[PDB]
């Protein structure tokens with residue numbers, strides 16, 4: 001007897017930069033273009 005909530009949904013359209021998801025490719029693109037925080041030699 002363990003039920004209640006299953007958190008947010010899941011979709012194939014996932015963001016590369018962060019861990020975001022969308023119900024379409026368009027909504028994903030507009031979000032991928034907004035990603036302009038990463039600049040210079042800084043990543044892992």
Ligand SMILES: [Zn+2]
Pocket residue numbers: 015016017018019020031032035
């Ligand atoms: Zn993102």
